[PDB]
Design a protein around this ligand. Structure first.
Ligand SMILES: Nc1nc2c(ncn2[C@@H]2O[C@H](COP(=O)(O)OP(=O)(O)OP(=O)(O)O)[C@@H](O)[C@H]2O)c(=O)[nH]1
Lengths: 249, 74, 49, 176, 74, 335, 50
């Protein structure tokens, strides 16, 4: 169990730097279509679905607020993937910290080649840039990718990446959050329990991976440090800092 | 449309004293929704002068929206 | 070239046909494999019932 | 003077880390349990096998933690490195990406691990000579540039694996 | 508290909400008694069929199930 | 009013701002302008002014070697500017298009190839240039990068649709022959050409060659091996340079087949230029994903966790951190 | 311009000679093969349906 007696934070209006999000790796299987699907559209054979190795996919990240795009989409450079889709690329988003509204969301859509000059979405995810308490997201976040749909920027997003606790609690999602909370040292370490519990989590995750073939794209947000202290960006407005009159009627 | 001329007067009387960014954006939302329903004379005389005023607001989001609003209104 | 054009039209169909025949065979092979997996599952499920 | 136990003269926390699908689990199974399988269950969280050894007549209980190699089970902070006595960084000789990332793991070790932690690069999947893409000199220049012990191993074609754990124990004992 | 239908529910008397909910496998027998770790990390449920099932409270997952050789009630 | 004096005032007003934008200190502004209005601005400046004022400004974007997005945006919008300047601009764009097909960012090559596809589709390239570009682009038909690979198909297919059937067989086919598996006359169908393409170079082989520092010696040695297969040289001497000996052994050990050696040579010009471009970027280069606030000079507010709408959400964050911090301490303290 | 015209003329002369020298591929033989491949496809369509 870690410790931190002081919380260091900065108003999003005070961080005059671009917001950068690193699109990391996409872990999971993309399902191939039937031969009848290849008969219906022969161009499918030449699509990236028919490359045996992990196709060289890229994610275009565009920030949306109130359903309107704040800036142009930024794309990961082309990288050749062998056995795993691992971009490990820090993307410089065209949105500054002071220019993000409180309801700002990042839509990341993974695209693959679909014949000559045509790109088709592999899947999309949308994550809010500010948390439920207005704190900008930190650390590594695994976003559920909705297959065959572009990332949606409307509010509320139709392709949400972080399924809130208000919906059906996915045992995988709850356990994934718990595994991460454990890794950071936010959960009590019980050596004997861990070996058994984590082994149980491995069985659950293995079983879920077989039935839920959904892909999860990892995105990591940058962290801010000054004098070795981490600072959190909280949504705040620049101007954030008499009902009865005797004479003025 | 005869009634809308009077309605525009309520909004326009406030745009010069708005203090909060939430309100400044809201004022622009009102102008965008009312603009398609006003007469061209009212648009150029009573709406157009206020958007350029907002373009000098201290909130950068407001300056951008002022340009977006002015572009759509015109 | 009018003649060569007609011959190349046939050659496109032939190469496409070979691809289609091969894809059909691959699809049929997958279908039989799936029917086998479903049959094996059906037998286990019938025993399970 | 202090309390000590006859079951182990020293207890070394080892720790396997490295990208997914490199061989971190199979190294642990091949050392601790002389076990292997082709069936892959992606490690999550932590695992904690035990083997007790004697080295130089002194008795060392190795406690050889696995770790998650998938990113979705991984976090910027990681408390697993805390109190580790040795760290073993693993790559798959058939996976260039898993090789390149070795520097990123050494970034992790240097941020969180014990300041004197004995690293050891282990080139797992060294049975895949048909597909080896990071070769001995290529790694040895890097490993020797850090001065970290190095080996190439296969948990499939076991024998290299044994020397990997013996090496880690040796380099730990030299610190202890 | 544990119920006959195998539901172990922890009612938080501060907020009146269920702090955690565990569902025991009735194949392991009727719940007869339970113990909660002093370190509050885990809890163990004993059953009428002699099964002792271990539950990790930190993750809220059943980790292991073992049955007494004689299957006698706990 | 006087119409020409007012129209000239409008042109003067728009010309002043467009040039003001094409010179903005933030590259995103240039990119935003290119995507949101470069076609509209060409009508605004006029045919003559657009080439001297607009194109001359747009060409300066290919000089930004650090931001590959801008170079990509250059190729995305040059299609529209060129369409307005006219064929009189083609002589200025011709050298620029060849520079794109050799960009450092593999995505810039994809955009440039697409740009060439769009430019050829619109008939913006002169007859001699269309054939000359096809010769430079045909080697890409075997590139390992699927985006580039399909991009090449896009260029070859557009070219094949633009020229006469006689010229396709007499001139277009000879440039494609080294990269196609079968001689099909119906190259005009995108599906046909995609089906007749030879397998691309293996990513391990292609990447290993482009990553080689001695690409000149490697290609020189490869040219000797090719001369051996062509019968021009009776025996290929072993590589004089041990670096080439290591590379040749590695490429063969990685599975370099005779077809892959032939494909590498066809791609020689692209690989050679790209290697130099990558070296130029390295020569110019807080890489850690960490933002240093001391470097930005921003003073953060700090609140001890031990004991307006934005203010309310802020109070909620402070409440959550305060509660969460105490809760974590209690769990450890209880052990 | 004169040289460019001569090169294009030479290329057409060569291309005509090449098409004239390329043995006339049997249109009938390819048509017979195509009829056979269509039958195989029809067989595979029925087999795939099965
Ligand atoms: N050929 C060969 N395959 C191996 C070897 N070691 C491991 N593998 C394969 O790789 C798989 C995964 O081994 P792991 O130890 O789980 O690799 P890992 O880094 O721990 O993967 P995660 O546990 O998900 O982090 C095994 O199931 C084998 O398929 C080896 O030595 N030779």
């Amino acid at each position: 169990m870690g410790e931190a007696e002081k919380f260091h934070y900065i108003y999003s209006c005070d961080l005059d730097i671009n917001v950068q999000l690193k699109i990391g790796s996409l872990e999971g299987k993309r399902e191939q279509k039937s031969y009848k699907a290849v008969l219906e559209d022969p161009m499918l054979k030449f699509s990236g679905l028919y490359q045996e190795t992990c196709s060289d996919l890229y994610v275009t990240c565009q920030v949306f607020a109130e359903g309107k795009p704040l800036a142009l989409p930024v794309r990961t450079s082309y990288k050749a993937f062998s056995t795993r889709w691992n971009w490990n690329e820090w993307l410089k988003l065209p949105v500054k910290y002071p220019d993000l509204p409180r309801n700002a969301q990042v839509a990341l859509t993974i695209w693959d080649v679909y014949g000559p000059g045509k790109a088709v979405p592999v899947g999309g995810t949308t994550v809010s840039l500010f948390g439920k308490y207005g704190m900008f997201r930190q650390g590594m976040h695994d976003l559920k990718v909705w297959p065959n749909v572009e990332a949606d920027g409307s509010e509320p997003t139709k392709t949400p990446g972080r399924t809130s606790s208000t919906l059906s609690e996915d045992q995988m999602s709850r356990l994934a959050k718990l595994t991460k909370a454990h890794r950071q040292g936010h959960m009590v370490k019980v050596d004997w329990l861990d070996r058994l519990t984590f082994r149980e989590i491995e069985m659950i995750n293995e079983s879920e991976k077989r039935s839920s073939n959904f892909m999860y794209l990892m995105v990591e947000f940058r962290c801010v440090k000054c004098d070795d202290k981490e600072y959190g960006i909280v949504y705040y407005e620049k101007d954030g800092d008499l009902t009865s009159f005797e004479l003025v009627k | 449309e005869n009634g809308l001329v009077i309605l525009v007067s309520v909004i326009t009387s406030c745009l010069q004293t708005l203090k909060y960014c939430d309100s400044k954006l809201a004022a622009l939302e009102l102008i965008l929704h009312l603009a398609p329903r006003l007469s061209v004379e009212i648009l150029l005389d009573r709406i157009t002068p206020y958007l350029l005023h907002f373009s000098n607001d201290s909130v950068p989001r407001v300056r951008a929206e002022a340009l977006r609003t002015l572009t759509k209104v015109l | 070239m009018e003649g060569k054009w007609i011959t190349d039209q046939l050659r496109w169909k032939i190469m496409s046909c070979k691809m289609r025949i091969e894809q059909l065979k691959q699809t049929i092979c997958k279908g039989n494999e799936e029917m086998e997996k479903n049959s094996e599952g059906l037998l286990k499920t019938k025993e399970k019932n | 003077m202090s309390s000590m136990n006859p079951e182990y003269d020293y207890l070394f926390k080892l720790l396997l880390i490295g990208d997914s699908g490199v061989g971190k689990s199979c190294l642990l199974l091949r050392f601790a349990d002389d076990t292997y399988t082709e069936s892959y269950i992606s490690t999550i969280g932590v695992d904690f096998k035990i083997r007790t050894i004697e080295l130089d007549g002194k008795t060392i209980k190795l406690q050889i933690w696995d770790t998650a190699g998938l990113e979705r089970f991984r976090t910027i902070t990681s408390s697993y490195y805390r109190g580790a006595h040795g760290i073993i960084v693993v790559y798959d000789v058939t996976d260039q990406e898993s090789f390149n990332n070795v520097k990123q793991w050494l970034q992790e070790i240097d941020r969180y691990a014990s300041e004197n932690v004995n690293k050891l690069l282990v080139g797992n999947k060294c049975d895949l000579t048909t597909k080896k893409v990071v070769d001995y000199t290529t790694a040895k220049e890097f490993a020797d540039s850090l001065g970290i012990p190095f080996l190439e191993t296969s948990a499939k074609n076991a024998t290299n694996v044994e020397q990997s754990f013996m090496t880690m124990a040796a380099e730990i004992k030299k610190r202890m | 508290y544990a119920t006959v239908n195998g539901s172990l529910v922890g009612w938080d008397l501060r907020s009146s909400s269920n702090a955690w909910t565990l569902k025991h496998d009735l194949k392991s027998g009727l719940i007869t008694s339970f113990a909660v770790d002093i370190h509050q990390c885990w809890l163990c449920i004993g059953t009428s069929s002699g099964t002792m099932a271990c539950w990790d409270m930190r993750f809220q997952l059943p980790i292991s199930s073992h049955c007494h050789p004689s299957r006698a009630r706990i | 009013g006087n119409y020409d004096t007012e129209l000239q005032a409008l042109h003067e007003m728009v010309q002043q701002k467009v040039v003001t934008l094409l010179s903005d200190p933030e590259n995103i502004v240039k990119q935003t302008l290119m995507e949101n209005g470069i076609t509209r601005l060409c009508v605004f400046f006029g045919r003559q002014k657009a080439n001297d004022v607009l194109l001359s400004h747009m060409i300066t974007f290919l000089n930004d070697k650090n931001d590959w997005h801008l170079r990509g945006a250059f190729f995305d919008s040059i299609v529209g500017v060129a369409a307005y300047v006219g064929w009189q601009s083609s002589s200025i764009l011709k050298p620029l298009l060849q520079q794109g097909l050799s960009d450092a960012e593999e995505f810039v090559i994809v955009k440039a190839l697409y740009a060439l596809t769009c430019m050829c589709q619109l008939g913006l390239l002169q007859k001699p240039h269309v054939y000359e570009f096809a010769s430079d682009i045909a080697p890409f038909l075997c590139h390992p990068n699927l985006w580039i690979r399909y991009g090449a198909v896009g260029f070859i297919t557009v070219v094949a649709r633009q020229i006469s059937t006689a010229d396709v067989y007499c001139k277009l086919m000879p440039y494609l022959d080294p990269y196609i598996t079968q001689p099909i006359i119906q190259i005009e169908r995108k599906l046909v050409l995609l089906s007749v393409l030879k397998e691309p170079v293996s990513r391990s082989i292609f990447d290993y060659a482009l990553r080689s520092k001695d690409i000149t010696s490697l290609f020189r040695h490869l040219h000797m091996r090719q001369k051996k297969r062509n019968g021009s040289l009776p025996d290929c001497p072993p590589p004089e340079d041990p670096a080439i000996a290591q590379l040749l052994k590695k490429l063969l050990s990685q599975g370099m087949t005779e077809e892959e050696e032939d494909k590498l040579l066809a791609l020689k010009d692209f690989m050679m230029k790209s290697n130099k471009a990558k070296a130029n970027i390295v020569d110019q280069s807080s890489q850690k994903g960490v933002i240093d606030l001391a470097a930005l000079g921003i003073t953060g507010r700090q609140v001890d966790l031990v004991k307006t709408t934005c203010k309310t959400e802020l109070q909620q964050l402070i409440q959550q951190k305060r509660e969460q911090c105490n809760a974590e301490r209690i769990a450890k303290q209880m052990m | 311009q004169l040289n460019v015209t001569e090169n294009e003329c030479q290329n057409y002369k060569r291309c005509l000679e090449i098409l004239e020298q390329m043995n006339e591929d049997d249109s009938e033989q390819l048509q017979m093969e195509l009829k056979e491949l269509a039958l195989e496809e029809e067989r595979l369509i029925q087999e795939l349906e099965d």
